């Protein structure tokens, strides 16, 4: 009775402490010791094994002292002996993989657990019978106790985390990894680097997000363990995005000593299901059979009707279906896609009638889906000569000077805006002109006719981006979204076209074409949905993803009706528009002058001609086929409404022959002219903020009604308005709301 059989730790449940270390030849083993040291309720080490490492005279001091330097040389947390024991000496635990057994087992203290060992382990396995029948150590079931983790002194620290290589710039212990530790698509950069400017869909390796905190409050005090698991999961997903990430797949990559490993394994499942629901992993164009739904059966019971089969509806439909939720999509047109619609009949090339460009591929779901599909994008070159009528290529210094001046007018507007309210908003177009004449009259500087036309060109570039003449767009709010982190990296041409992704998202889903929804009634126990021919559908929840213009036209009857607040938000945004023309030629007539540039600009002769074929795109990055695509923006959209396709073509060809005046231009052998503005179920290209409006409108439209009626679409995404990406993400957003 010289020594103790009781644990130092007050409240500890261990009635019979035994020493896991047996490092000292004088180890107390399971008998009496001066003091029992507590790592967990199930794990202790005696005073002499403590001293074996902690005392300068003992034979373990060497090792401990070295570890302590490293722990300090690429680590930040305190290197006590308890920390050393949890990181270096604590025996590993591994779960038997026999389906009928599944018992946890302690490995002998010299065996170093690896993924391979964890993957295939079953009771009794040693490098050099009836092992599964032996009872499971009692301390294992203990780990499930609510207080077990509170009785655990130091948080776990993962070893050889898949996330480690992507996290070199951090101290491993701040991201749940062990300091004592020693080709991914370039577009996958899920982790912020230390002190780096904001970018879209990026997370801090060392801080829990709002939603994470909300779902896992028990970690607000200490996130170490959560962060490590979440980081490991993200790294695994992006390491192989072509298959579903499962707990079985994650478990072998969780390497840490002691019973706590059991806690980590049991936690990785909850975290993984949270990441899946929010759409962080197991997403994109990944598809899974009935046998393999991504969420447990408890999310499964409920039904959804999704209205619209564009990127937004299809994203949500894909997500929900993958979750195991019963989904039905109703599409008005005779095709899926919405504002994604590819013409695949041009020999050797795919020409988008709608979207075909990706602005910022880093962390972009579109770039992820390309990886999953094994398709390539073409990054745009920089050069874009501004060609005049007829023939002269504008001096680049004139291009850069007027660009500089145009952005200048924008800066001053961003100053004038700082003290105005929505009630005081003025059209961007008006305020620009005004600032221009002001500046002109101040410093008498005058611009050449060509300078004024090049400015006309740059102005047209903003009208294109807004989908409207600037006299309808808000000076206060035109660029509201820039407030949020935007997608970094390459701007590309989706050569194969967005349709490839649309089709994958749609494959195997219950989709009803030519079924235009007319009535939505959510006043009863289930949502009653009625099409224009009187066909009835019903489900517990309904997701609306129709274009902004269709909400403004009130094409769908809501009962109860949308709120006045919602109607104001809906009416405060503009239904922006542009159209495209695509021309096929017998040969690449522009090669001599264009010299391999992806696109070239067309200087407007006069303000009146602004936006009329402002830019031409060479639609084959391989420089082999001959297809040009051009855009009609701003006022020019109007002037084309009353013309038939043949007439639009005439003016394009005439424009081209002016642009290439000093040479012959062959006749086109195939073309299309888009009519988005008069497509009855679309009537637009993309949204923008009208004068008097706020970026807040996007949130307000996005707001669900009574957790019964939900909304998605490009016009509901405040961070990323307008884009296929933003539309897709809004659909993922709603799928997460709905699945909860």
């Amino acid at each position: 009775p010289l020594g103790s059989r009781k644990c130092e730790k007050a409240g500890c449940t261990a009635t019979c402490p035994v020493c896991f270390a047996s490092a000292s030849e004088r180890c107390a083993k399971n008998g009496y010791t001066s003091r029992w040291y507590h790592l967990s309720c199930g794990e202790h080490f005696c005073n002499e094994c403590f001293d074996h490492y902690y005392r300068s005279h003992k034979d373990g001091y060497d090792k401990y002292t070295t570890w302590k330097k490293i722990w300090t040389s690429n680590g930040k947390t305190e290197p006590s002996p308890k920390a050393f024991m949890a990181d270096q000496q604590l025996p590993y635990w591994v779960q038997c993989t026999k389906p009928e057994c599944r018992k946890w087992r302690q490995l002998t203290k010299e065996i170093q657990l690896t993924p391979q060992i964890a993957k295939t382990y079953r009771c009794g396995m040693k490098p050099n019978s009836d092992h599964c029948s032996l009872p499971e150590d009692l301390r294992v079931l203990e780990v499930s106790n609510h207080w077990w983790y509170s009785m655990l002194i130091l948080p776990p620290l993962l070893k050889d985390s898949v996330a480690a290589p992507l996290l070199s710039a951090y101290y491993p212990d701040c991201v749940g990894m062990s300091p004592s530790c020693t080709g991914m698509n370039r577009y996958f950069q899920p982790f912020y680097q230390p002190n780096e400017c904001g970018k879209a869909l990026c997370v801090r390796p060392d801080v829990m997000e709002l939603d994470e905190l909300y779902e896992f409050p028990e970690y607000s005090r200490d996130p170490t363990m959560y962060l490590a698991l979440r980081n490991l999961i993200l790294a695994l997903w992006y390491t192989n995005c072509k298959e579903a990430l499962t707990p079985q797949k994650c478990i072998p990559h969780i390497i840490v000593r002691g019973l706590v490993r059991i806690r980590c394994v049991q936690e990785v499942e909850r975290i993984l299901y949270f990441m899946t629901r929010k759409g962080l992993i197991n997403t994109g164009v990944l598809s899974v059979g009935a046998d393999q739904y991504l969420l447990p059966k408890d999310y499964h019971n409920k039904s959804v009707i999704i209205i619209g089969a564009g990127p937004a509806g299809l994203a949500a439909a894909r997500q929900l279906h993958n979750f195991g939720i019963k989904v039905t999509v109703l599409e008005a047109k005779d095709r899926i896609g919405g504002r994604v619609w590819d013409d695949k009949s041009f020999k050797g090339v795919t020409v988008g009638r709608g979207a075909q460009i990706v602005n910022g591929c880093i962390n972009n779901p579109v770039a992820l889906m390309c990886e999953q599909l094994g398709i390539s994008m073409h990054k745009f070159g920089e050069r874009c000569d501004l060609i005049q009528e007829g023939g002269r290529i504008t001096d680049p210094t004139i291009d850069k000077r007027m660009d500089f001046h145009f952005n200048a007018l924008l800066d001053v507007v961003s100053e004038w805006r700082k003290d105005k309210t929505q009630l005081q908003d003025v059209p961007l177009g008006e305020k620009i002109e005004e600032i221009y004449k002001a500046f002109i009259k101040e410093s008498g500087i005058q611009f050449s006719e060509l300078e004024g036309q090049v400015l006309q060109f740059h102005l047209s570039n903003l009208e294109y981006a807004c989908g409207s003449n600037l006299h309808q767009v808000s000076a206060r709010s035109w660029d509201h979204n820039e407030f949020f982190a935007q997608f970094a990296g390459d701007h590309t041409l989706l050569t194969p076209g967005y349709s490839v992704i649309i089709e994958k998202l749609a494959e195997g889903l219950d989709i009803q074409l030519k079924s235009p929804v007319q009535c939505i009634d959510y006043s009863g126990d289930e949502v009653q949905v009625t099409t224009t021919d009187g066909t009835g559908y019903s489900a517990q929840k309904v997701l609306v993803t129709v274009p902004l213009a269709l909400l403004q036209k009130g094409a769908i009857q809501f009962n109860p009706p949308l709120s006045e607040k919602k109607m104001k938000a809906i009416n405060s945004l503009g239904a922006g528009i542009i159209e495209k023309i695509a021309l096929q030629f017998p040969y690449r007539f522009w090669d001599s002058k264009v010299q391999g540039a992806d696109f070239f600009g067309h200087v407007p002769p006069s303000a009146s001609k602004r936006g009329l074929f402002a830019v031409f795109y060479d639609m084959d990055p391989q420089k082999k086929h001959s297809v040009l695509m051009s855009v009609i923006a701003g006022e020019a959209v109007a002037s084309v409404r009353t013309l038939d396709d043949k007439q639009v073509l005439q003016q394009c060809m005439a424009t081209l022959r002016e642009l290439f005046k000093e040479q012959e231009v062959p006749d086109p052998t195939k073309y299309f002219v888009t009519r988005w503005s008069t497509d009855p179920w679309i009537q637009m290209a993309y949204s923008f903020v009208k004068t008097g409006g706020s970026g807040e409108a996007y949130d307000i439209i996005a707001e669900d009604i009574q957790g019964t009626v939900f909304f998605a679409g490009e016009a509901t995404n405040r961070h990323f308005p307008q884009t296929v990406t933003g539309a897709y993400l809004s659909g993922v957003r709603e799928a997460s709301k709905i699945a909860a």
Binding site: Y192, G198, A200, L201, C202, V203, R204, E209, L210, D211, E212, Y214, K278, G279, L280, F483, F484, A485, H719, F720, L729, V732, R733, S736, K737
Partner: peptide, 12 residues
């Protein structure tokens, strides 16, 4: 600062 915050983990 929501000039950093992940769009998908900021919905509450």
């Amino acid at each position: 600062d929501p000039h950093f915050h992940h769009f998908l983990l900021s919905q509450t």
